[PDB]
Design a protein around this ligand. Sequence first.
Ligand SMILES: CC[C@H](C)CN(C[C@@H](O)[C@H](Cc1ccccc1)NC(=O)O[C@H]1CO[C@H]2OCC[C@H]21)S(=O)(=O)c1ccc2ncsc2c1
Lengths: 99, 99
Amino acid sequence: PQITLWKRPLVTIKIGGQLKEALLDTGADDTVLEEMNLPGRWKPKMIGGIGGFIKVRQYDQILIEICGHKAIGTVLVGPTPVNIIGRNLLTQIGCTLNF
Amino acid sequence: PQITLWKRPLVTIKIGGQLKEALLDTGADDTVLEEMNLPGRWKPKMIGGIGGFIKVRQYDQILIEICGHKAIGTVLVGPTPVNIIGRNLLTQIGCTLNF
Ligand SMILES: CC[C@H](C)CN(C[C@@H](O)[C@H](Cc1ccccc1)NC(=O)O[C@H]1CO[C@H]2OCC[C@H]21)S(=O)(=O)c1ccc2ncsc2c1
């Protein structure tokens, strides 16, 4: 599909067996999800943006389904105010910017 | 153009007569640029990101050219980690997400 940017580009995703709303975010290197209790091993990480840094948990090889398009990669979990789909998964679903 | 996302979507912009590099950021409502001198009046404002809120200078109706496309709108100037072009100007140049 084609998503205009009049409004936040929020879409439904499926991760860890849950449905959630997330931003398709070309400004995010990595994918960052709101606090959730995923199983498996993780590594601590810190990621920075406007206002400073937050501490997140890095999970690897996590399956996410974005508007029916499957993707698998690194997902960061932490106290973000919004679920963010970053470029590491946007490339996997064939997402491009066009103007 | 069609921009893929295996690399950061960095582009050259012209603002206040000066060339700068900026990130096309579909996850940003607003356009926030690093500290710089801009002509015209401004008002203090606050904006929040992943790490908290910062103080910015708000310049309204600023001319800004993004890869040869003209936009005129609000530009926030402050301690952002990177120059970001948000949806308020991405819409003006006709940018959409496609997958
Ligand atoms: C340094 C480049 C930008 C700031 C990076 N950000 C993604 C950006 O889309 C962010 C994503 C975001 C969106 C909403 C709340 C918090 C973060 N939006 C944002 O900060 O926008 C601000 C400016 O417009 C306003 O509207 C939204 C907030 C304001 S981010 O969320 O901090 C982010 C995401 C993944 C990531 N991986 C490594 S670093 C890193 C940083």
